[PDB]
Amino acid sequence: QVQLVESGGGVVPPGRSLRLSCATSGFTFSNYGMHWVRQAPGKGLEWVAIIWYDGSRNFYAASVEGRFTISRDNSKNTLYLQMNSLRVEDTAVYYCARAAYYDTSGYGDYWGQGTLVTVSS
Amino acid sequence: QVQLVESGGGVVPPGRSLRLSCATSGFTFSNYGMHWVRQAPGKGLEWVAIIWYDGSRNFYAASVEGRFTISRDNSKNTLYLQMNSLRVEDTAVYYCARAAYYDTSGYGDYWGQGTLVTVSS
Amino acid sequence: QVQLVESGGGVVPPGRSLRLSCATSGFTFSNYGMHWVRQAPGKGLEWVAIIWYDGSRNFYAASVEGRFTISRDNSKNTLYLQMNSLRVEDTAVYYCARAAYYDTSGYGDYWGQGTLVTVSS
Amino acid sequence: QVQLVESGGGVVPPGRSLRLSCATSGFTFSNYGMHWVRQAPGKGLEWVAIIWYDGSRNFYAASVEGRFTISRDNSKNTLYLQMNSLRVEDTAVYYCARAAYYDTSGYGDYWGQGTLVTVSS
Amino acid sequence: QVQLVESGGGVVPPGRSLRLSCATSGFTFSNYGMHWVRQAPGKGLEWVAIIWYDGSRNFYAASVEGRFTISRDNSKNTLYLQMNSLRVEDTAVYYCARAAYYDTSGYGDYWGQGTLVTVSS
Amino acid sequence: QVQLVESGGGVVPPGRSLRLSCATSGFTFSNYGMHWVRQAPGKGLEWVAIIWYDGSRNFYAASVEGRFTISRDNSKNTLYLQMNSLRVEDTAVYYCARAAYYDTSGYGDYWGQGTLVTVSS
Amino acid sequence: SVLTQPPSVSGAPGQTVTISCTGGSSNIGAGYDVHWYQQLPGTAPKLLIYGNINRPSGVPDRFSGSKSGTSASLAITGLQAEDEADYYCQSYDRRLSGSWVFGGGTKLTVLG
Amino acid sequence: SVLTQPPSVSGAPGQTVTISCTGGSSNIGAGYDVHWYQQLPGTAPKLLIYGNINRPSGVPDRFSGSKSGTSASLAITGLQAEDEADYYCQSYDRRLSGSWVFGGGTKLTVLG
Amino acid sequence: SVLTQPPSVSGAPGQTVTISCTGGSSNIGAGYDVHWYQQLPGTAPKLLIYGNINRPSGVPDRFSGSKSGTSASLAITGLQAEDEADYYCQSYDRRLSGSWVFGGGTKLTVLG
Amino acid sequence: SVLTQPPSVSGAPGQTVTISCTGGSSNIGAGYDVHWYQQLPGTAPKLLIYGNINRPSGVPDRFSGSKSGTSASLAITGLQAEDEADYYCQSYDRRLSGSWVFGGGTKLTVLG
Amino acid sequence: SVLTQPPSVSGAPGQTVTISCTGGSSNIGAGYDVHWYQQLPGTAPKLLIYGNINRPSGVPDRFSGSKSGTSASLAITGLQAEDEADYYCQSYDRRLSGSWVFGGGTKLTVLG
Amino acid sequence: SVLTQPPSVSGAPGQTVTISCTGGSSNIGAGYDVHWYQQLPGTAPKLLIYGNINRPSGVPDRFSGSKSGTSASLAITGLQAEDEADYYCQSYDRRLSGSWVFGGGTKLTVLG
Amino acid sequence: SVLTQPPSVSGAPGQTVTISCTGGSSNIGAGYDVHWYQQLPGTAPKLLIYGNINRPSGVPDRFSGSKSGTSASLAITGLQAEDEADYYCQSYDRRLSGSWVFGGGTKLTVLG
Amino acid sequence: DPNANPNVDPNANPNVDPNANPNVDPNANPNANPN
């Protein structure tokens, strides 16, 4: 059974860093790419970042590029997201999802539980 | 934030070479193509060259083809322009721009500060 | 400056093969398609063959189809014309030209120097 | 010289399938569409099918549509005609012809030798 | 042989939508346009809509324009009809027909089995 | 139902430009041509312009030719009327109408709400 | 205004009145059709008659019209309270470069 | 139903009957083609005559058709028991926005 | 939110409702697939439909979807009380630098 | 055989002969091109004339063709003993869904 | 400069001015997008409008753009003292081997 | 040589001569471009005019070109001694499978 | 089973039979190879055809295969008594995460 | 002509045209695409 468990949330003052992680079990971690998706309270879903199966390629949304950093460690089956210079607009619930590709577009085929990151002063 | 800083200008006699550079920060350099654009004093803008994100394809303007060379170093986030056999009409301010593509044509969302190249005797 | 220089001409008895080449400099060879044009002595011009910039498409004249072969090698900036089973009517001066396209018809902006191939016994 | 050689004929009982082929040489196969034309013994010529150069468009006669299928493989210069549910009036000699177009109508410039397909019990 | 099979009928209360499909077999679907023709019980025939072979062009009757939608899927050989905001006057038997054109007017060479749509309260 | 809504009017000083629009819904916009008409306060109607469905043919009244420009965008179902160098005589309520042709002359089956344009100083 | 119409017509409720439309040899008498529009005081014109005899679904059976020679007319029977409006006759003039030409417009008055 | 047909015609077996389809100057009087469809009581319509004279393979030689001026006619000779069906004449009308227009429809009853 | 959705859709139990997701010529009109997700009130999103017609093992036969032109639709037939959730459409937009683009999200309320 | 040809013609050596190919207003009368083929008794057809006047390299000057109205004709001068063959005319018919339509074929015999 | 722009446009603060960028059948009339740039007297160009209608985050609502046929226009409503700059239009020309083609450039002077 | 040119033309220095290149409805009458070339007696051909009106950098103002219908013309004003050369026109023919088709070639002789 | 095979195919000894394998645009229509296996009732599968045309050493010349478009076929000529076996077609599906995808399996029975 | 029918015209052949050129176009741009 595919299990994605997240951690590393909490309350952070604006302007400093926070690191999230998504521990994985139930599948071959090194064969799949991963996504990060966030949802602001009361809003819809927003795509954040993707990383390739070998970590060779990274893509980011226009609103977080240069501040966020996605990385993986295939020897520990863990996915990371380093968030620097956090702003109030970044307060949301972050989900790690497992990448899948069908014909001409990709989807998320198993999702994690989600973690809440709060930025306030 | 996207930051493009250029250097390598100066004064050079006609007939010999010069090399420019455009150091980048705040975005994934290996994901984007880049442009060079120049502006003669008191004149309009003129497109010069483009390079693909992987460096496979290069395109040059008709007036600079065979003399100018564009290249990039993805491990240093630097864009180069090797200018050979310089002439008097090559006196202009050179900019590096980040490539973007909308529907059927391209544009440049982020520009550099510009560096002045003067060819004189 | 654009320079097209050919070679490989000479005198050949009818019924056998001969190879031509057109070495290039002063422009990006892999961004352009190339033509071959010949001129029988004291006569007009005649279109022979064309090759795409990547070499995917080749078109030949009716009189030379099935016998001539056009190919390019993007690593040495050279263009080839393999002539097989030459006839007496194949004696002419062969030019290599660079392809250009304006609105609905193409033309050749830069021509070579010309090489002479004589078929006689 | 254009060579069109057909093969795959013989005698077959009605109600079952047979596959014809037309091997080509002497011209660039992938630049031309092809035709199939059949002639019943003692009768006139009848058009059967045409396939585009890339295989994107296929057209069949009303008397054979749904039963015949034309196909090509550009990597071996071979043209195929898969005949299914063969009937008695399908007995004829089949030719493969090279497509041509003049102003507003098409013709065939080069033809094959032809093979006999006999359907009887 | 040409077979047109229809499915998706039933009883539906007025004010809402129902979808119809006409699966095709025995010919090249992408080569022909199609029609929809309906017949209310005890009445004559009424033309509903036409769709081009590539789907670029769509037409509807005055009494159904703005409520019905015609579409096709060339990779599954199936024709669709999306009827929104069904009324009592829409109760009829719906036919899918293959388009044909003779000189100046069109006709339908082959017709489907038909399906019954009942709209009542 | 045919829904034609207009906007973009107001009060404008003479000698400059103003732009109007007519949004459409409830019918296929690309299959029909459209009209612009204007009615001065206390006067009758006066035809202004007609545009073909594909936009190839544009016709204007003699009093507005050279100053009025009509355009449509079939991907947005919106019709445009560009008015330049407006005069005091151009103050009228502008309507958009859908073109229809019966035998030898045209008429408008459905009309828009209309908007008022004021040109005064 | 190549098409000429009376400036104002009136009649008692329930009677029959006619709105004429006079043209020339280039617009009505040249073989072209005549269409009629009814404009309420507070809305855009609404189609009344097309093809010189045909009416849409919305138009009631009371309205009718006909054409002959260079003259066309609209006939109204059984005048009602809501029939008060401006009626325009439309055709195409051969001598201009416009698809439509409109008349002066006739105001119908119901003496209720 | 811009194309006018008689609602019902009949005849004895083996005799000759004619079916008329009257149109207007915009559909049949404009030179557009006329086609005929046959609908058995329990099945979908089938093509009978296209191009005003031409018949498909399955159609026997009993049926024939022709047109002249504004009217088109379908001729049946040698009436049989199985000819009982509904016959529709189909054309195109210039004045509408429809690819096809159908007639009212005629029912053939054989007095057997 | 390049893909726009109705903000809310409601229906009575046992009937059929439709959720639409219409885009432009760069995401859905360009030939890219549309996928659907379901988010129950207190948990993470779950995949509902992928490839515009396919559903995972856990998703019942009640849900179905299809796309045509520049619009994609999700059809839910026979509502239950446990169908109250937010539904999001996901595709790829050619004009951005992201792998996924989501819709606004439609909340379905079943009128129990 | 939508194109009509006489079944057989004959002529003495050294004389000129004419082979006709009559079509209709849909294939030849519509302005489409006419091409001619020659088939010797034991071989495949060979192109004789294309574009209604043009001939390939191998074809001698004796063969010539033209067209006018709905008819196209092939003229042979200096008839020889090697001209015994079947001659087919080919065009395109607007009313069908095929690229080529052929004639019936004319057998030419030279009276040796 | 395959695209033509007026050399200068001026206006007092508070009203609207238009900068035109006419093209041809190869760049703007061929369906390629038109983008706009602004260059303050002592700085590098800054993107103003892309996709002929869209603007980035930093650009206010005063600037808007549109194109029709082979021409494009830039509308600046409510002139301020800070709008004095050069405005360039950019497209792609099919007849050249360059990614971008720029216009002549229009200098905007605010009549303070 | 599909395109027809006069084999030779002549003129005295200082005056104007014209070189015509007559084509057909498939090459020049089909709307394809006409390009001109110059070949000095001992060198390779050099591009002179492209796009029927445009000239490269090295070509002086004396050479100009135009086209109309199925014909094209090369006008040389102010004859000089160095104009002794062959002039070829080039276009595309729809009926062939070649990228370019050339004209016969005209020898321009100055009467020094 | 993303590849569709007929559940059973039969034929008399000495005749020719064909087993088909129809896929989609992701497995066979995408350009991937199709291989065939033969399983006797009591033994493990044996490779029959690989590369769509090639066969191992032990396989006789009777078996042959080909592919075109979205479908592939296995042709057996000269049926014998021992050819009663299950035949499977294998390819690669782009839409899954597996090396191989198999067909349903066709059981061949010769009428002995 | 101001009085032509300003609408798309039905009653036109909705099927593919088989009378088209089935060969490749040699009059196409042979150079790399910078756009």
CA distance I46 to C30: 48
**Per-residue 3-state assignment (H helix, E strand, C coil) for D1-29:** CCEEEEECCEEECCCCCEEEEEEEECCCH
Cα angle, residue D18 at apex, residues D13 and D20 outer, rounded to 5°: 140
CA distance D21 to D30: 16
Query: Does residue C44 come out as left (phi exceeding 0), alpha (psi in the -120 to 50 range) or beta?
Result: beta
CA distance D15 to D9: 16
| Residues 6+ positions from H107 with CB-CB distance below 8 Å | H7, H8, H9, H84, H85, H86, H87
Q: Tell me, in Å, the resolution of the deposited structure.
A: 3.0
Residue D75 tokens read as 């990597």
Instruction: Scan for tokens 């393979």, then name that residue.
Output: H57
Q: Does C33 touch chain N (CB under 8 A)?
A: yes
- Closest of L40, L59, L41 to residue L49, by C-alpha: L59
Which amino acid belongs to residue F21? Answer: S
CA distance D6 to I64: 50
Closest CB from E16, E17, E80 relative to I68: E80
The beta strand positions in chain L, using DSSP E, are 8-11, 17-22, 35-39, 46-49, 63-68, 71-76, 85-91, 101-102, 106-110
Instruction: Scan for tokens 């009309």, then name that residue.
Output: F111
Instruction: Scan for tokens 């060779």, then name that residue.
Output: A56
CA distance K58 to G27: 58
CA distance F57 to N4: 10
Q: Is the CB of residue D111 less than 8 Å from the CB of residue D95?
A: yes
SS3 B36: strand
CA distance M3 to M6: 10
Q: What is chain F's length?
A: 121
Q: Which N positions 14-33 lie with beta carbon below 8 A of chain B?
A: 32
CA distance D63 to D86: 12
Q: Does G98 touch chain F (CB under 8 A)?
A: yes
Determine which of F28, F98, F103, F104 to mutate to test the interface with H (most H C-beta atoms within 10 Å).
F103
Query: Count of domains in chain A?
Result: 1
Q: What are phi and psi of H109, to 5 degrees?
A: -120, 125
- Closest of J10, G94, E28 to residue N18, by C-alpha: E28
CA distance D107 to J47: 8
SS3 C31: helix
- Closest of G11, G2, G6, G9 to residue G105, by C-alpha: G6
CB F71 to CB K16 under 8 A? no
Contact residues on chain E for H50, CB-CB shorter than 8 A: 100, 102, 107
Residue F47 tokens read as 């035809």
SS3 J68: strand
- Closest of F70, F73, F76 to residue F25, by C-alpha: F76
CA distance C75 to K17: 54
Q: Is the CB of residue I44 less than 8 Å from the CB of residue A4?
A: no
Q: Is the CB of residue A113 less than 8 Å from the CB of residue I44?
A: yes
If one counts every other C-beta atom within 10 angstroms of the C-beta of residue H57, the result is: 6
Instruction: Scan for tokens 């060259």, then name that residue.
Output: B49
CB M95 to CB A31 under 8 A? no
Q: What are phi and psi of B21, to 5 degrees?
A: -150, 160
CB C101 to CB N31 under 8 A? yes
Q: Bridge-partner residues for A120, per DSSP?
A: none
CA distance H33 to H65: 12
CA distance J77 to J60: 10
Q: Is the CB of residue M85 less than 8 Å from the CB of residue M41?
A: yes
* Residue B42 host element (H or E): none
The beta strand positions in chain K, using DSSP E, are 8-11, 17-22, 35-39, 46-49, 63-68, 71-76, 86-91, 101-102, 106-110
CA distance C2 to B66: 8
* Sign, CA torsion M69/M70/M76/M77: negative
Residue N29 tokens read as 């741009």
CA distance J2 to J90: 10
Residue I106 tokens read as 């439609």
- Closest of J83, J88, J92 to residue J104, by C-alpha: J88
Residue F74 tokens read as 């079939």
- Note the helical H segments in E61-110: none
Which amino acid belongs to residue L24? Answer: G
Q: Does M96 touch chain A (CB under 8 A)?
A: no
SS3 M82: helix
Q: Does N23 touch chain G (CB under 8 A)?
A: no
If one counts every other C-beta atom within 10 angstroms of the C-beta of residue C35, the result is: 25
Nearest CA in chain D to L30: D103
CA distance I70 to I2: 12
The beta strand positions in G50-111, using DSSP E, are 63-68, 71-76, 86-91, 101-102, 106-110
| Residues 6+ positions from K48 with CB-CB distance below 8 Å | K35, K36, K37, K38, K55, K56, K59, K63, K74, K87
Q: Is the CB of residue F5 less than 8 Å from the CB of residue F22?
A: yes
Q: What are phi and psi of J93, to 5 degrees?
A: -105, 125
- Closest of D117, D79, D70, D76 to residue D98, by C-alpha: D79
Q: What approach was used to elucidate this structure?
A: cryo-EM
Nearest CA in chain N to D105: N19
If one counts every other C-beta atom within 10 angstroms of the C-beta of residue H96, the result is: 16
Q: Give the CA radius of gyration of chain A.
A: 14
Q: Bridge-partner residues for K71, per DSSP?
A: K22, K68
CA distance M81 to M74: 18
CA distance H17 to H8: 12
Strands K8-11 and K106-110: parallel
SS3 B88: helix
For the domain M8-110, what is the CATH code? Answer: 2.60.40.10
Number of separate helices (H) and strands (E) present in chain C: 0, 11
* Sign, CA torsion I57/I58/I64/I65: negative
Residue H47 tokens read as 């093509």
Instruction: Scan for tokens 């004589």, then name that residue.
Output: C118
CA distance H78 to chain E (A): 25
Residue F39 tokens read as 């009615």
> Do F and G touch, counting CB pairs below 8 Å (3 needed)?
yes
- Note the helical H segments in I11-110: none
CA distance G37 to F39: 14
CA distance E82 to E88: 16
Q: Give the CA radius of gyration of chain H.
A: 14
Residue H20 to residues A106, B48, H78, H103: CA-CA distances in angstroms?
A: 61, 76, 18, 10
Domain boundaries, chain J: 8-110
| Residues 6+ positions from M87 with CB-CB distance below 8 Å | M5, M19, M36, M37, M38, M39, M48, M74, M105, M106, M108
| Segments forming the whole domain that contains residue E8 | 3-119
Determine which of M17, M68, M71, M77 to mutate to test the interface with D (most D C-beta atoms within 10 Å).
M68
A7 DSSP assignment = E
Q: Is the CB of residue D106 less than 8 Å from the CB of residue D97?
A: no
L19 DSSP assignment = E
CA distance G85 to G19: 12
CA distance E77 to C36: 46
Q: Is the CB of residue G102 less than 8 Å from the CB of residue G88?
A: yes
SS3 M75: strand
CA distance B20 to B80: 6
Which amino acid belongs to residue J104? Answer: G
The beta strand positions in chain B, using DSSP E, are 3-7, 10-12, 18-25, 34-39, 45-51, 58-60, 68-73, 78-83, 92-101, 106-111, 115-119
- Closest of G87, J40, E39, A41 to residue H39, by C-alpha: E39
Domain of residue B36, CATH code: 2.60.40.10
The beta strand positions in chain J, using DSSP E, are 8-11, 17-22, 35-39, 46-49, 63-68, 71-76, 85-91, 101-102, 106-110
SS3 G58: coil
Give chains near A: 3+ CB pairs under 8 A: B, I, M
> Do D and G touch, counting CB pairs below 8 Å (3 needed)?
no
Burial environment of residue F5 by CB neighbours within 10 A (0 to 12, 13 to 18, 19 or more): middle
| Distance in angstroms between the alpha carbons of the first and the last residue of chain M | 31
M43 DSSP assignment = S
L70 DSSP assignment = T
Q: What are phi and psi of E53, to 5 degrees?
A: -65, -40
| Residues 6+ positions from A22 with CB-CB distance below 8 Å | A4, A5, A6, A7, A34, A78, A79, A80, A81, A96, A112
Q: What are phi and psi of I69, to 5 degrees?
A: 65, -125
Determine which of C2, C25, C31, C32 to mutate to test the interface with B (most B C-beta atoms within 10 Å).
C31
CA distance B44 to K106: 10
Which amino acid belongs to residue L44? Answer: A
Residue I4 tokens read as 């726009």
Q: Bridge-partner residues for F23, per DSSP?
A: F5, F78
Q: Give the CA radius of gyration of chain L.
A: 14
Instruction: Scan for tokens 């059809």, then name that residue.
Output: I75
| Residues 6+ positions from K21 with CB-CB distance below 8 Å | K3, K4, K5, K28, K34, K71, K72, K73, K74, K89, K103
If one counts every other C-beta atom within 10 angstroms of the C-beta of residue K98, the result is: 21
- Closest of G30, B30, I35, C67 to residue F105, by C-alpha: G30
